[PDB]
Design an enzyme around this catalytic site. Structure first.
Site, short mmCIF file in Angstrom:
data_model
loop_
_atom_site.label_atom_id
_atom_site.label_comp_id
_atom_site.label_asym_id
_atom_site.label_seq_id
_atom_site.Cartn_x
_atom_site.Cartn_y
_atom_site.Cartn_z
N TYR A 28 -11.66 -6.65 8.35
CA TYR A 28 -10.43 -6.01 8.29
C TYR A 28 -9.88 -4.90 6.45
CZ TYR A 28 -9.47 -7.10 12.85
OH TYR A 28 -9.12 -7.05 14.26
N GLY A 30 -9.63 -2.86 3.52
CA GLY A 30 -10.47 -1.79 4.05
C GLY A 30 -10.11 -0.29 5.31
N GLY A 32 -9.55 1.01 7.47
CA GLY A 32 -10.11 0.61 9.39
C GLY A 32 -9.84 -1.17 9.60
N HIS A 48 -1.47 -6.74 7.56
CA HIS A 48 -1.25 -5.70 7.36
C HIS A 48 -1.65 -5.19 7.47
CE1 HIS A 48 -2.08 -2.33 3.73
NE2 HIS A 48 -0.64 -3.93 3.51
N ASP A 49 -2.90 -4.28 8.16
CA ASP A 49 -2.59 -3.06 9.00
C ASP A 49 -2.62 -3.52 10.18
OD1 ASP A 49 -5.37 -2.83 7.50
OD2 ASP A 49 -7.06 -3.24 9.18
N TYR A 52 1.45 -1.79 8.65
CA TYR A 52 1.27 -0.38 8.62
C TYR A 52 1.14 0.74 9.42
CZ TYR A 52 0.35 0.02 3.52
OH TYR A 52 0.02 -0.26 2.87
N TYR A 73 7.49 4.40 -2.82
CA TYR A 73 8.28 3.24 -2.66
C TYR A 73 8.68 2.60 -4.47
CZ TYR A 73 4.88 -0.63 -2.28
OH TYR A 73 3.55 -1.51 -2.75
N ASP A 99 3.75 -4.85 1.80
CA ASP A 99 2.57 -4.72 0.85
C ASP A 99 2.50 -6.38 0.02
OD1 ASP A 99 1.09 -2.35 1.26
OD2 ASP A 99 1.66 -1.58 -0.19
CA LIG Z 1 -8.30 -2.58 7.22
#
Ligand SMILES: [Ca+2]
Ligand SMILES: [Cl-]
Length: 123
Positions: A28, A30, A32, A48-49, A52, A73, A99
């Site tokens: 995960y 990076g 995708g 985190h993915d 987003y 931001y 983040d």
């Molecule tokens: Ca990712």
């Protein structure tokens, strides 16, 4: 934006170059990400993915043409603590929180070298 996220991670992990150390890690961290996270760091990246993805479902976010990687931001690093700003509008604030959460997560889990540049036969 990725410039801010890099700085956040350095805030928590001052020895790191995060765009090197925390890119292409696990399934995960990076571009995708699918399959089962290989370890807790990879799970930080899955979260985190997902964060987003949830920033993009926001009515707030559907205007900045930027993606979360390009959406600037405002935040500070001070005494190795990250603070998102009240001057951020809703999309910006949501991404800043994603983040910040991930940077903190990265700083609290093991780093397993065996998962750096993992083959996406494992994912
Ligand atoms: Ca990712
Ligand atoms: Cl913090």
């Amino acid at each position: 934006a990725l410039w801010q996220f890099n700085g956040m991670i350095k805030c928590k992990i001052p020895s790191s170059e995060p765009l090197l150390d925390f890119n292409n890690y696990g399934c995960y961290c990076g571009l995708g990400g699918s399959g089962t996270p290989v370890d807790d760091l990879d799970r930080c990246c899955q979260t985190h993915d997902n964060c987003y993805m949830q920033a993009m479902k926001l009515d707030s976010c559907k205007v900045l043409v930027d993606n979360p990687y390009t959406n600037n931001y405002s935040y500070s690093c001070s005494n190795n603590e990250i603070t998102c700003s009240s001057e951020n509008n809703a999309c910006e604030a949501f991404i800043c929180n994603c983040d910040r959460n991930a940077a903190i997560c990265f700083s609290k889990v093991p780093y397993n070298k065996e998962h750096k540049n993992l083959d996406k036969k494992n994912c």
